[PDB]
Design a protein around this nucleic acid. Structure first.
Ligand SMILES: [Zn+2]
Ligand SMILES: [Zn+2]
Ligand SMILES: [Zn+2]
Ligand SMILES: [Zn+2]
Lengths: 71, 83
DNA sequence: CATGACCTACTGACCTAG
DNA sequence: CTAGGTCAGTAGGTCATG
């Protein structure tokens, strides 16, 4: 009904300040527990949709942080 | 327990959207990384466990024909609505 | 060289404590 | 209602072998 702000999949609620799906919510929580560092093999700006969200963890985390997800 | 849709070997899960063995899974990924594959026959070779490496064109051909694609990837367990 | 068995490093549907 | 935890799940790296 309401799409995830990060990837556009079916959202499940407001998680860490942003309407996200369960995948982006779990992905972001795991990134903030270890203080992750990802690197983009491409142009530092890869489209984050439902099927591409796992192809760059750097740009997925970047989308989460830019739209205000915080713990 | 489910035979590989490409070659009939024991599959190890759903890879790029298709139930495949470890061999066809790694073969498809390498084919997309790169790519040239030519068939010395009529582009119709049977793909089974013993013959899967004899013609790479017909192996990748079968991979794509069954829908193997980086867009068909799905992680996690399967949903209640899929049982 | 390419192949594929094996292992790592994750992914996300589902549930409960709060 | 939503963190957080669980565990059934997979991409992809390795490298001895084909
Ligand atoms: Zn999402
Ligand atoms: Zn990227
Ligand atoms: Zn196979
Ligand atoms: Zn052939």
């Amino acid at each position: 009904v309401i799409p995830c702000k990060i990837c556009g999949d079916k959202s499940s609620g407001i998680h860490y300040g942003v309407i996200t799906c369960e995948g982006c919510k779990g992905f972001f929580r795991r990134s903030q527990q270890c203080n992750v560092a990802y690197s983009c093999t491409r142009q530092q700006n890869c489209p984050i949709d439902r099927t591409s969200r796992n192809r760059c963890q750097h740009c997925r985390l970047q989308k989460c942080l830019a739209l205000g997800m915080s713990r």
